[PDB]
Write a protein that binds this ligand. Structure first.
Ligand SMILES: Nc1ncnc2c1ncn2[C@@H]1O[C@H](COP(=O)(O)OP(=O)(O)OC[C@H]2O[C@H](O)[C@H](O)[C@@H]2O)[C@@H](O)[C@H]1O
Length: 169
């Protein structure tokens, strides 16, 4: 059931682990079965996790995503799709957290994290915690209280990581 080479993760719960790391570098090191992208409904991979993952695939993720949207239309807020992980992972699970900065319901963050339960092991970011404007501690708490499968969270920002791991969740 895949034993992966995740290294240097702090344990949060039975099934959630966390590390101060760039998700791109973790994916290159581990080559997991599933890397999660913090996507938008249009799969336009501009910045943050999505832009960094896409750049590391030499834009192949974006080209594949454009074909996905042309065939299927936008994802739902809280929804997901499974696409290739290209050189980074077997699969990329593109998951859309709510864009709280655009008035989308923060409750949809739970629906977003539920997608993780369809996969035994994931390398993932904190959904909605960047430009989508959700409180990062809240995103972590929802993750812990929603995901039952094994999730390795990569937190790029050191100061944020230090705050998250010293917080009650
Ligand atoms: N390379 C990285 N590795 C790990 N964590 C990262 C990295 N880059 C950012 N983070 C953290 O990952 C967390 C999420 O930040 P975000 O990636 O903005 O995702 P969202 O769900 O809020 O916004 C999605 C939009 O952003 C994109 O443009 C998409 O195309 C969408 O339009 C934050 O804590 C970041 O510090």
């Amino acid at each position: 059931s895949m034993v992966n080479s995740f290294s240097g993760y702090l344990k949060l719960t039975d099934n959630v682990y966390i590390k101060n790391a760039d998700i791109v570098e973790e994916a290159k090191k581990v080559k997991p079965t599933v890397v999660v992208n913090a996507a938008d409904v249009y799969l336009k991979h501009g910045g943050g996790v999505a832009g960094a993952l896409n750049k590391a695939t030499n834009n192949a993720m974006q080209v594949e995503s454009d074909d996905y949207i042309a065939t299927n239309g936008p994802l739902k807020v809280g929804g997901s799709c499974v696409l290739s992980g290209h050189n980074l992972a077997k699969h990329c699970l593109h998951v859309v957290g709510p864009n709280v900065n655009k008035g989308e319901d923060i409750q949809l963050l739970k629906s977003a994290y539920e997608n993780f339960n369809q996969h035994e092991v994931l390398l993932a970011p904190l959904l909605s915690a960047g430009i989508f404007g959700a409180d990062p501690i809240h995103s972590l708490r929802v993750c812990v209280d929603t995901v039952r499968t094994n999730v390795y969270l990569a937190v790029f920002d050191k100061n944020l990581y230090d705050k998250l791991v010293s917080s009650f969740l």
